[PDB]
Amino acid sequence: GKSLIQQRRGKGSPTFKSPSHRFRGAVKYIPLNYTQEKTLRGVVEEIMHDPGRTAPVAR
Amino acid sequence: MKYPKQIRTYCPFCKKHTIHKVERVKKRPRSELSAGQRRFRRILKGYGGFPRPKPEGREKPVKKLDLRFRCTECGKAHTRGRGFRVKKFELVEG
RNA sequence: GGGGGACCCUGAGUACCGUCGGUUGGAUAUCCGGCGGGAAGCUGGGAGGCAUCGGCUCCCAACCCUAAAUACGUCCCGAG
RNA sequence: GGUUGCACCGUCCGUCUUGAAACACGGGGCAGGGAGUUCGCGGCCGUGGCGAGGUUAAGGGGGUUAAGCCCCGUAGCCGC
RNA sequence: CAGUUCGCUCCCGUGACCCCGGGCUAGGGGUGAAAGGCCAAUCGAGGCCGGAGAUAGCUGGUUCCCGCCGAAUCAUCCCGCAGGAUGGCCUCCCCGGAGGUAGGCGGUGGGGUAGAGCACUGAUUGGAGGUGCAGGGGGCGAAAGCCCCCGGCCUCCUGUCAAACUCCGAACCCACCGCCGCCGUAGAUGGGGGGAGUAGGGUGGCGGUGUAAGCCGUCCACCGAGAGGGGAACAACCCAG
RNA sequence: CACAGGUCCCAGCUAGCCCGAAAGGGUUUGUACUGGGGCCGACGCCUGCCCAGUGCCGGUAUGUGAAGCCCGGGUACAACCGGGUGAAGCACCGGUAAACGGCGGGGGUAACUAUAACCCUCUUAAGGUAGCGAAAUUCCUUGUCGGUUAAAUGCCGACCU
RNA sequence: AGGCGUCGAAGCCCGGCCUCCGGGUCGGGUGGAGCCGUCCAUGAGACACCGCCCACUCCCCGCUGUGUGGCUAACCCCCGAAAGGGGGGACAGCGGUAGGUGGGCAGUUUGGCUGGGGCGGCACGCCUCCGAAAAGGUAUCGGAGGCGCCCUAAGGUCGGCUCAGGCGGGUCAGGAAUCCGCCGUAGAGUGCAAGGGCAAAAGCCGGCCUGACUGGACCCGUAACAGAGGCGGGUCCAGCCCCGAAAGGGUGGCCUAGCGAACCCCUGUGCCUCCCCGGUGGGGGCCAGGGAUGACAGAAAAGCUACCCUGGGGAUAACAGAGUCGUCUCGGGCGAGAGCCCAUAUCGACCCCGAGGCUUGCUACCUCGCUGUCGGCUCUUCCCAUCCUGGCCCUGCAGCAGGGGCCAAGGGUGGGGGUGUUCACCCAUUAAAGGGGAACGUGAGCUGGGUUUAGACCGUCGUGAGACAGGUCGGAUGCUA
Ligand SMILES: [Zn+2]
């Protein structure tokens, strides 16, 4: 027979690939070396809307 | 059908009539050392479909009787005629 | 260039065994490869179409090179 | 010999089919092309050689413009 | 005009809207608001070269002339039924030597069809006679039984039958003998070898089946494979090869 | 067909699902108000019974269960024969129907001689509950009754065989 | 048949523990010379001694694996350019092997006969009777039936007897229990279908036995004529045997059914053989018996296609033609009976003889390298078995009307409702509102409502793909004569 949608999604075609260029970037913590044994201050500069995140993001 | 346990018949080894005990041949499984079984096992290995027929549920309603008559003086067993098929076979003493 | 020795050397995950796939006429007795195991090494080792024991015969792997007789014709001479 | 007149007869061609003029299939005309070939093995026959024997294959020698021609070649095969 | 166009009519026309440039997804794969839709006029698996001169028991075709002989569609087996094999039937060559038999006459044997018949088996109308025979209706009961209709069985008379009946029984056919006839030493009967084609038959009489047409066998006479003369033409009918 | 809305299933992330020969990879610059897999299809009122069958999920004391391993026999060694252990899976047990599907049949019964059954008794797992009904589903069929026409194989309303 | 004893014991007193707490043992002391059995009983005798053990159970050590808990150093995952850190951890992953699950993905099969195919059935392997036509042979989805077993006796042989049914007689006893006479050609039985054969037997009752055997030859049938693997049967030679006095008979059932290749495997039995030779384990070969293919001269085997494709077939179905007329329409013969009497004004039972080809059916003769369907519209033509119109006859014909029949085909035979409808039903008119043929007239004239592709919904059936002479919406009509 013919393929399923789930089967076709595993080949990473543009029909199924996520558009990870409209987004603001991944939100990961700073490297553990800075955070462990030391405490860092930071200032919130901007709050904006991430196209695909379901949550607002901040700088 | 009822059959005697012993009957006196011509013995090809004694060359005269002697008492013989009646026995039924008992089937045995295929010997793994035979040439046919060796060939069958050799071909079965590897990739491919089953290389031999697989008859299913093929068996006559009643089979013939494979009997052997063992002389009571020589101890040798000989065959006697061609078998006949019956579904009941009771050996009766005498 | 020949006779003696009593001392030394002669190729290892190799030969080979079990198992699996392929290949072969190779049939319990072809060859290649994978997986587990794996020697003697000159007071030595291998082969003789199932396996083993004894006799007899032949040979010395696991390193390398080697012209001529052979295949073809993008081409040439010659012939039908 | 060309054409035509009269008397009588005559429903085209190839094909499958029991049966074709067929309301069964293939048929506008002309010219060229077009369909039991080659090898291997086996059975037969027509003819010819030798004959309890027959025959050479690969190949070799002589001669030649040449692959023709001449001679050898007992491996092998069949028969006994 | 066009391997999907033209006119009128009609629907959407701020949105899941329409269109250009640059890119990505490729064949058991892509893509699909899911119609097996679309993927360069090709989609229930694209196109191009290659395997490849694929294979078919199925369709079509198969090229000069005259001479001689000349069939068959039926028995057995096959996943056999539009196809094959072994036989039967045709043709060509050879050996081997003295007989052979399609027709007829007589004889020695076999048969159970047509017809006929009831002696077996099984049916079939009525009348007479004899039987309690475990019928059944009633009269007739302390029980033991008898008095009649009716059912059955047997014999006779009377009127009818049979593919799966026969006490009988042809025409006719078959085997063998003797003879006539015919063929054969210009080599038959018979034997060995080479090559086939034939496995759909039709009409005509007979038999089983069917309302009939027809279906299935049998007879080998004619067409198939056959001219000429006729029945108006006609496959089969008549004369005639 | 899609759609918004409803509900069900898998997954705590080295996950779940998927493409590949492998290496690697899509969902993923993602993290349960998320990613993936089914069905129904705005909205209003509702969604009854059944787990025996098939499917799936959990358990598995016990039976079976391949190789390997162990023991006895055999072979101056093997091939070979008989037993013990033996995972998954089956057998067994339990949940599960907005999972696939199923939701009949008889014996009957009350103010006639009226039909039907409030109600009892067997039958398989249980016997179709609210609704709707000659329906785009009804063979008899142009069912029967009423409206529409002078005339109705039509359309509409009703009965439920 | 005796054993121990200063090579130290009873008989009392404490304690741990196994435990059927039966009751056996054990560390300590008072203890200072004796205690069991040989005896008997017990299916089997000694806690008299000496042996290897039998079943449950404990433990010291070496090895072996299974499970649990922990550790880091292999291996993996994370941050980081790296150095280095964190998380997991002998799990995972990877490589080899073994079992299961597995339409996710492939290659295939899913037979034939058939008055077309499908369902049905088996005429698909055998036996008897008829078909069958008096030698042999002879087919159909021809007619009436059986077989796929059973029997150590229902087999071999020897002797003796004669059956079914009936009549007469006899206690219980009756139709039927067991008995005595007569008749009795088989009307009984012979294992089972049918046919054939059987009377001092092939039947019933008994005695003995296992020829239902081994090694072979030839011949007939399946399968005539006329080819055959396999199979069945018949006539014999030899060996060893059974019955019988003897002749004679016995190679299964009185004859005709009851069954099956290659390869492979099992069993018996003696031999030959395995690569230079010999021994051993094992294998190979010859002969005999056995395991089966019922589609029965022998594949291992499920479906849909309406998305379908290819090669063919009029060897074969649907529409139309052709043959036939069971059926259909129409007509006739007799006259029971009904008609107040009167068969025939009218009807015409039961039965019998016909016409047409206007309904349906049957056959498979022409047409599958295409002869385009039903209905409707348009238009032409023909038959009479005459609906109206013209002319008549009988009447249970007073008139007006009716019923039946005859001659007659020039003319007419219309309009509407539901339904695709032909048809049938209904409405208002009318003289009447007749039936039929022409490729069921007429699509190189038209329309396309139904039938009959490709899309979709409902009911039922199927596990599913899917199907329905069950409904429903949509769905193309080519032309220069
Ligand atoms: Zn003996």
Swiss-Prot record, chain A:
GO terms (BP aspect): cytoplasmic translation
The keyword Chloroplast is assigned to this record: no
Keyword Electron transport part of the UniProt annotation: no
Molecular function per GO: rRNA binding; structural constituent of ribosome
Key words, A-Z: Ribonucleoprotein, Ribosomal protein, RNA-binding, rRNA-binding
Record's GO cellular component terms: cytosolic large ribosomal subunit
Domain of life according to the entry: Archaea
Region Disordered, annotated ranges: 1-20
Its job: One of the primary rRNA binding proteins. Required for association of the 30S and 50S subunits to form the 70S ribosome, for tRNA binding and peptide bond formation. It has been suggested to have peptidyltransferase activity; this is somewhat controversial. Makes several contacts with the 16S rRNA in the 70S ribosome.
Stated family: Belongs to the universal ribosomal protein uL2 family.
Subunit structure as annotated in this protein's UniProt entry: Part of the 50S ribosomal subunit. Forms a bridge to the 30S subunit in the 70S ribosome.
Protein known as: Large ribosomal subunit protein uL2
Lineage: Archaea, Methanobacteriati, Methanobacteriota, Thermococci, Thermococcales
Shown chain mapped onto the complete sequence: 2 to 60 of 239
Swiss-Prot record, chain B:
UniProt keywords, alphabetically: Metal-binding, Ribonucleoprotein, Ribosomal protein, RNA-binding, rRNA-binding, Zinc, Zinc-finger
GO MF entry, a single one: large ribosomal subunit rRNA binding
Record-linked Pfam families: Ribosomal_L44 (PF00935)
Function: Binds to the 23S rRNA.
InterPro entries in the cross-refs: Ribosomal_eL44, Ribosomal_LSU_eL42, Ribosomal_zn-bd
Needed cofactors: Zn(2+)
Keyword hit for Zinc-finger: yes
Cofactor, how bound (note): Binds 1 zinc ion per subunit.
Subunit note: Part of the 50S ribosomal subunit.
Segments forming C4-type zinc fingers: 11-74
Protein name in UniProt: Large ribosomal subunit protein eL42
